[PDB]
Design a protein around this motif. Structure first.
Motif, PDB file in Angstrom:
ATOM      1  N   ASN A   1     -11.316   1.454   3.144  1.00  0.00           N
ATOM      2  CA  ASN A   1     -10.368   0.648   2.345  1.00  0.00           C
ATOM      3  C   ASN A   1     -10.794  -0.832   2.208  1.00  0.00           C
TER       4      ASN A   1
ATOM      5  N   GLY B   1      -2.111   5.718  -5.248  1.00  0.00           N
ATOM      6  CA  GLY B   1      -2.059   4.257  -5.137  1.00  0.00           C
ATOM      7  C   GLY B   1      -0.667   3.754  -5.502  1.00  0.00           C
TER       8      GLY B   1
ATOM      9  N   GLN C   1      -3.913   3.528   3.054  1.00  0.00           N
ATOM     10  CA  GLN C   1      -4.281   4.045   1.745  1.00  0.00           C
ATOM     11  C   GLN C   1      -5.772   3.829   1.497  1.00  0.00           C
TER      12      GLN C   1
ATOM     13  N   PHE D   1       0.876  -1.142   0.000  1.00  0.00           N
ATOM     14  CA  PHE D   1       0.000   0.000   0.000  1.00  0.00           C
ATOM     15  C   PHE D   1       0.901   1.174   0.000  1.00  0.00           C
TER      16      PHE D   1
ATOM     17  N   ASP E   1       0.387   4.965   0.086  1.00  0.00           N
ATOM     18  CA  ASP E   1      -0.355   6.200   0.160  1.00  0.00           C
ATOM     19  C   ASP E   1       0.543   7.307  -0.378  1.00  0.00           C
TER      20      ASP E   1
ATOM     21  N   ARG F   1      -5.739  -0.818  -6.256  1.00  0.00           N
ATOM     22  CA  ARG F   1      -6.683   0.112  -5.674  1.00  0.00           C
ATOM     23  C   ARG F   1      -7.363  -0.679  -4.544  1.00  0.00           C
ATOM     24  N   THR F   2      -7.706   0.001  -3.471  1.00  0.00           N
ATOM     25  CA  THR F   2      -8.391  -0.646  -2.336  1.00  0.00           C
ATOM     26  C   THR F   2      -9.830  -0.242  -2.319  1.00  0.00           C
TER      27      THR F   2
ATOM     28  N   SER G   1      -9.527   6.683  -8.991  1.00  0.00           N
ATOM     29  CA  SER G   1      -8.523   7.013  -7.955  1.00  0.00           C
ATOM     30  C   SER G   1      -8.861   8.343  -7.265  1.00  0.00           C
TER      31      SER G   1
END
Lengths: 273, 236, 119, 40, 255, 110
Positions: E167, A198, E124, A184, A186, A252-253, E134
């Motif tokens: 998330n 991402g 994230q 991950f 950020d 992507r989460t 995004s």
């Protein structure tokens, strides 16, 4: 080693099972702290729960196809799966992608193992045997436009011609540009309102590319190449919390708007056993 | 040339193989590993932490609240909750102990199950927890409960009481996935006496619950877990 | 010969995301691709992506990385794709077309769907 | 026995057997004792 | 006769008493420090303004109510304003620093409710439009202020959700990270001392956040019988072991 | 990324006037696919693969070229010519269409 020592009745000032959990310290309490027990044994060290396991099995990670047919008259070869490729990564296939997203940064060497089978789904007069050649186009590498470019020389590019119906086991060292892989991230390539957030950014090892070295027999053949990968020589840092809500794209989460609950409902009562 | 004979199982692609294999990138030297706080060795180190069990599912959706085991002021002898111990399901199916233990097929050890009150400082209570090993059923009221491993708990400064479910089984391992021979049992919690409330305050208060695994915990045979899926390949 | 029947005139409030469709009729969907083109008003024959039902193999034009998210359903033989975070640029016209019979580019073509973004 | 000239070349290793919860179980600065009133 | 229910912390020139706290947490049990040589990469001689940035900045009081859902604060940024730190941070190419985070909130022996201060390295987020959509820079980069889950989406906005800490992870598995509870009845404040967690020796701060603080009311604020149903929450962080490297033209961030 | 460009931008053609268009991509496109659009219609396949009169695309038409710049012909424009033209590249990958030699019709003054 021991399971749990013997314990008799009690009565003190020292109350083991009474802590303040808002400190953040999960008390290492015990059975033999709450009752009368007996000495027992352990004879177990979870070899099977070690991270050089629960991370390091051979699992698939991606599956495409190609075909050998007559190219005579193709505008774009790709569009014809005459040859193909792969933006190497792992997110494609969720089963393994869940294991890895169990910790934050991970590190290791891999066992990328390839296999591939063919179909003559239409009036074939023999199952031909081809030889697949898989290349590795490092990011910055020239690119195969056709099933018989020059790109397919692979002068300085690590390639392996194997055979259909068969497999190949080519293992590669870890090639992070850093002390370990970001899972991950950020972050953004740069302080610019309009870039993508991402890890999509942190992760090119570029691609893979497979074609079929024979000149189209007469009938048509399709090959479905499968890529299997085994992490090995691992280390992992900072666990996190396991995925509950499903996946939506590589790196992507996200999760889908309008989704069935993940918390199983309790039919009846809470009182309900 | 040295005489060989090939055995059955040639070229079998068993995925669980620790074999020797060549370097596609020879002579290549890696990025020097540095240091990073927190580092796992064995799943079993991390599942010794606590997470919250949503013992309060009873919702239309998922809820921050499915986590709040409520308490009702000025009642008594009544039940607070219940459930069984198929830590490979129900409530438990969505905790770090679940989701991981879910990854394996066989388990054993003793769960530690924690319970923290958040009632106004000046309110009291004295209730009781209680594990009921396998044979009868959900105790269905104090008395019946109390004759099982259980633990009276007086609420004071120490918000948390840590009850521990003694591993009490004949066979020495249990199918993670639900099964009755390999059944775990139950557990509850009843108003010892009752929940008091200070003057000029009101409503309900709550219990949070967590469950962690013990020093002794045990897990073997690696299976795949159900909890995830993808109908199709994901995209860039 | 087949058909690329399309979704119907769309009005989307800005910031949303809609899905227009397509459906093949009398050729084997599961074999050729479906491209999509954003020919806006008095605007060019723009290329969003192209998807392949056959295994989900595909490609997109770097404008639409995020915007367009091409997709095919193997039974209703209906391509799609849907735009995210609509803006009045998405106020243009989307067409789908069957690609690679090979002597010809996207030979078979669909009529289109009108996408207009505004309140 | 190692037939390859490299490091990836090598096969899996096995049991680390270091295992220390502390790191996650009890990152308290002012350390807590099991059997002592948590915070006094 | 001293108790974890009483600690002071002096940094640069600022302290913090608290006659409460439930001890303090040291994530991953590491203690914050400087970049050892063996481990270094950038060739430049690092700079370390110690007491001029390794001090105590006070973000601001969010107000907890029986309405509020939660709040978060990404960290290399949240302070990206606070005097010398906040520049030395923009004036350099790459930096490196460890934090502290005495979070706060007082009440009484009549009020009920508790919080869940937590820290998540390389946390994230997720867009609220599914697909491969995004989130953009000016959404994951708030600071002074922070973002709020008890609010509603903007376009490209993160997801604003506590149930899946935006998330895809149940709020209740969070405890796998450093954290602690403010439990209005055994408590009032919280602490966490956070060492540099990222996978590079030294790294950037303009374009990146290595962990974010999250405060999330796991169990509801519920005042007595008639009183103002809102308890502020005020956060405080103080970096330390800061180490800036490669000065220049000052950076310009989006927006 | 081979950037396309329809040769004139548009003119006008008195039926009889022979019409010739061109595409001038930056790089090398091997196969010129020519599409046309009388508005209110889906664009349609005129000439595929550099010089082939698609289906129903009349004889006045034709064209060619290569590498870079290809072209179109209509031995003399008609009525059914005053349309828009799209050369179209398929060789390079973000597959990209032409520009638009809007074919123009010529008539008398009224």
């Amino acid at each position: 080693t021991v399971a749990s020592i013997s314990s008799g009745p009690k009565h003190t000032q020292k109350v083991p099972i009474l802590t303040a959990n808002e400190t953040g310290a999960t008390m290492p309490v015990l059975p033999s702290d709450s009752i009368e027990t007996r000495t027992t044994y352990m004879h177990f060290n979870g070899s099977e729960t070690d991270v050089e396991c629960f991370l390091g099995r051979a699992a698939c990670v991606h599956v495409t196809e190609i075909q050998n047919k007559d190219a005579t008259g193709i505008d774009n070869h790709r569009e014809a799966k005459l040859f193909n490729d792969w933006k190497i990564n792992l997110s494609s296939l969720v089963q393994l992608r869940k294991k890895l997203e169990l910790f934050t940064y991970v590190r290791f060497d891999s066992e990328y193992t390839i296999l591939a089978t063919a179909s003559q789904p239409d009036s074939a007069n023999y199952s031909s045997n081809l030889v697949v050649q898989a290349m590795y186009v490092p990011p910055g590498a020239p690119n195969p436009k056709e099933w018989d470019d020059y790109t397919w020389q692979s002068a300085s590019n690590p390639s392996v011609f194997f055979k259909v119906g068969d497999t190949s086991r080519f293992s590669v060292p870890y090639v992070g540009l850093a002390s370990a892989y970001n899972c991950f991230y950020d972050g953004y390539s740069h302080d610019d309102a309009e870039t993508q957030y991402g890890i999509t950014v942190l992760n090119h090892m570029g691609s893979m590319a497979f074609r079929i070295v024979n000149e189209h027999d007469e009938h048509k053949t399709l090959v479905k190449i499968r890529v299997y990968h085994r992490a090995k020589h691992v280390e992992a840092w900072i666990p996190r919390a396991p995925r509950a809500l499903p996946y939506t794209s590589i790196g992507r989460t996200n999760y889908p708007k309008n989704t069935e609950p993940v918390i199983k409902k309790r039919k009846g009562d809470i009182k309900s056993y | 040339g040295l005489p060989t004979t090939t055995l059955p199982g040639s070229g079998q692609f068993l995925t669980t193989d620790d074999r020797q294999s060549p370097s596609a990138l020879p002579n290549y030297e890696p990025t020097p590993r540095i240091h990073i706080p927190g580092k796992v060795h064995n799943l079993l180190e991390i599942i010794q932490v606590d997470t919250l069990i949503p013992m309060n599912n009873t919702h239309t959706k998922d809820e921050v609240n499915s986590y709040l085991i409520p308490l009702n002021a000025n009642r008594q002898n009544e039940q607070v909750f219940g459930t069984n111990l198929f830590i490979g399901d129900g409530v438990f199916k969505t905790t770090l102990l679940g989701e991981i233990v879910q990854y394996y097929t066989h388990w054993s050890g003793s769960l530690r199950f924690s319970l923290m009150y958040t009632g106004p400082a000046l309110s009291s209570a004295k209730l009781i927890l209680a594990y009921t090993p396998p044979g009868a059923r959900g105790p269905q009221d104090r008395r019946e409960a109390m004759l099982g491993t259980h633990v009276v708990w007086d609420i004071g400064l120490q918000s948390t009481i840590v009850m521990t479910i003694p591993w009490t089984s004949g066979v020495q391992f249990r199918y993670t996935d639900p099964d009755t021979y390999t059944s775990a049992g139950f557990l509850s919690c009843w108003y010892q006496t009752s929940l008091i409330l200070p003057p000029e305050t009101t409503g309900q208060v709550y219990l949070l619950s967590f469950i962690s695994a013990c020093p002794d915990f045990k897990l073997r045979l690696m299976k795949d877990t159900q909890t995830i899926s993808q109908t199709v390949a994901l995209t860039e | 010969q087949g058909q690329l029947q399309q979704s119907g005139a769309e009005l989307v409030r800005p910031g949303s995301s809609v899905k227009i469709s397509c459906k093949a009729s009398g050729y084997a969907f599961s074999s050729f691709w479906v491209n999509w083109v954003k020919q806006r008003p008095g605007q060019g024959l723009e290329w969003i992506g192209q998807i392949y039902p056959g295994d989900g193999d595909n490609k997109y034009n770097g404008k639409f990385k995020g915007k367009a998210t091409l997709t095919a359903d193997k039974s209703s033989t209906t391509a799609y794709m849907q735009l995210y975070s609509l803006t009045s640029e998405d106020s243009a016209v989307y067409f789908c077309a069957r690609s690679g019979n090979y002597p010809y580019a996207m030979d078979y073509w669909g009529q289109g769907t009108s996408v207009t973004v505004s309140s | 026995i190692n037939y390859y000239k490299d490091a990836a070349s090598t096969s899996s290793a096995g049991q680390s057997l270091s295992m220390d919860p502390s790191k996650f179980t009890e990152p308290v600065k002012d350390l807590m004792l099991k059997g002592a009133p948590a915070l006094n | 006769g001293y108790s974890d229910r009483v600690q002071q912390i002096t940094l640069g020139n600022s302290t913090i008493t608290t006659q409460e706290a439930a001890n303090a947490v040291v994530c991953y049990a590491e203690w914050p420090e400087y970049l050892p040589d063996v481990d270094a990469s950038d060739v430049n001689k690092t700079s370390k303004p110690d007491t001029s940035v390794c001090r105590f900045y006070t973000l601001d009081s969010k107000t907890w109510t029986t309405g509020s859902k939660g709040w978060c604060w990404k960290l290399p940024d949240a302070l990206k304003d606070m005097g010398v730190f906040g520049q030395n941070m923009f004036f350099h190419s790459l930096g490196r620093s460890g934090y502290t985070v005495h979070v706060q909130c007082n009440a009484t022996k009549f009020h009920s409710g508790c919080l869940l201060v937590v820290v998540i390295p390389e946390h994230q987020l997720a867009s609220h439009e599914g697909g491969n959509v995004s989130v953009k820079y000016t959404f994951t980069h708030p600071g002074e202020r922070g973002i709020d889950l008890s609010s509603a989406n903007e376009v490209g906005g993160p997801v604003k959700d506590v149930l899946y800490n935006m998330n895809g992870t149940l709020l209740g598995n969070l405890l796998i990270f450093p954290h602690q509870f403010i439990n209005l009845r055994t408590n009032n404040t919280a602490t966490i001392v956070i060492p540099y967690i990222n996978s590079v020796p030294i790294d950037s701060m303009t374009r990146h956040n290595n962990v974010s603080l999250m405060v999330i009311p796991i169990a509801p604020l519920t005042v007595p019988t008639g009183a103002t149903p809102s308890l502020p929450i005020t956060v405080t962080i103080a970096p330390m072991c800061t180490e800036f490297s490669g000065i220049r033209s000052k950076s310009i961030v989006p927006q | 990324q081979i950037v396309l460009t329809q040769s004139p931008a548009i003119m006008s053609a008195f039926p009889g006037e022979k019409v010739t268009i061109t595409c001038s991509a930056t790089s090398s496109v091997n196969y010129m696919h020519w599409f046309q659009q009388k508005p209110g219609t889906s664009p349609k396949l005129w000439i595929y693969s550099s010089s082939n009169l698609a289906s129903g695309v009349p004889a006045r038409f034709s064209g060619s070229g290569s590498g870079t710049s290809y072209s179109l012909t209509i031995s003399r424009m008609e009525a059914e010519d005053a349309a828009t033209y799209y050369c179209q590249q398929r060789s390079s990958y973000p597959i990209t269409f032409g520009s638009g030699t809007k074919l123009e019709i010529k008539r008398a003054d009224a």
